[PDB]
Amino acid sequence: RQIKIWFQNRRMKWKK
């Protein structure tokens, strides 16, 4: 629901 859209959102965090 909001775990597959958050996982791809947090992936941007890595980006220094």
DSSP alpha helices (H): ranges in the chain?
7-14
* Alpha-carbon dihedral sign for residues 4, 6, 12, 14: negative
Chain breaks in the chain (C to N over 2.5 A) after: none
In whole angstroms, give the CA distance from residue 16 to residue 3.
22
In whole angstroms, give the CA distance from residue 8 to residue 16.
16
- Find the farthest-apart pair of alpha carbons in the chain and give their distance in angstroms, rounded: 27
* Alpha-carbon dihedral sign for residues 1, 3, 8, 15: positive
In whole angstroms, give the CA distance from residue 16 to residue 5.
20
- Dihedral angle at the C-alpha atoms of 10, 8, 6, 3, nearest 10 degrees? -130
